[PDB]
């Protein structure tokens, strides 16, 4: 996160950690034994981590949970982004607390305007490499299609929109993948890219989750 402020322990409770032996990406509980995140995300081997907030220390209310499955979205594209959402299933379903909770899944689409809390591990810096030892939060307005796609030409389908300052400074950035991008209590997106982190005229992109809904309903309950 560019621009962003420190969260606060546990004050973000969906919020996970996906660990091979490094932190390398975000995602969201959305209940018990199923996480979100985004398929550039995937890899083998992934350690889920709840209750996270400095990622260095064990300082309590950490789970450590391996997934059992990762499912990528069958037309998840790798070259356009389109379909940037996986789903991944615990071995052991977590314990929910005030620490580890999940996040509501939408039942419509967020409207330009609306602002969201987007959260991660990621890079704190648009030149050069900085990670945080502890979770980074910031507000973000979803911008409006027509921005989206003017700053974006030709790359920004219908499972996409943009959030954040065109003006720069503020964005999300490489480690905060798959995170979260929550609307009034609700998840509307996953981290999913851009160009650079926090340049003027080029918003982060994320990924539509509105659209998939019954997608991940179906998925859940067939698994
Ligand atoms: C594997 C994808 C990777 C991903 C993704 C990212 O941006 N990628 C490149 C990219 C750029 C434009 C695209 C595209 C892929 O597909 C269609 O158009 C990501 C990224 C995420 C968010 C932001 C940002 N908010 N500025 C910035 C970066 N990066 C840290 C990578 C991990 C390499
Ligand atoms: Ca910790």
């Not at 929910?96 to 967020?110: D, G, Q, Y």
């Not at 030149?127 to 003017?150: E, M």
């Not at 340049?199 to 989750?209: A, L, S």
Request: proline share 4%; aromatic share 8%; glycine share 12%.
């Amino acid at each position: 996160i560019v621009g962003g402020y420190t969260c606060g322990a546990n004050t973000v409770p969906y919020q996970v950690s996906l660990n091979s032996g490094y932190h390398f990406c975000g995602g969201s509980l959305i209940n018990s034994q199923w996480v979100v995140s985004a398929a550039h995300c995937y890899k083998s081997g992934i350690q889920v981590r709840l209750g996270e907030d400095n990622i260095n220390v064990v300082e309590g209310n950490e789970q450590f949970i391996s997934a059992s499955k990762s499912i990528v979205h069958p037309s998840y594209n790798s070259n356009t982004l389109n379909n940037d959402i996986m789903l991944i299933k615990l071995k052991s379903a977590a314990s929910l607390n005030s620490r580890v909770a999940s996040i509501s899944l939408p039942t419509s689409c967020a409207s330009a305007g609306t602002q969201c809390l987007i959260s991660g591990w990621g890079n704190t810096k648009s030149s050069g490499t900085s990670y945080p030892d502890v979770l980074k939060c910031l507000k973000a307005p979803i911008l409006s299609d027509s921005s989206c796609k003017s700053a974006y030409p030709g790359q920004i389908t219908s499972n996409m929109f943009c959030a954040g300052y065109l003006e720069g400074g503020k964005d999300s950035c490489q480690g905060d993948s798959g995170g979260p991008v929550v609307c009034s209590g609700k998840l509307q997106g996953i981290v999913s890219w851009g160009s650079g982190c926090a340049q003027k005229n080029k918003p982060g992109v994320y990924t539509k989750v509105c659209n998939y809904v019954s997608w991940i309903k179906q998925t859940i309950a067939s698994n």
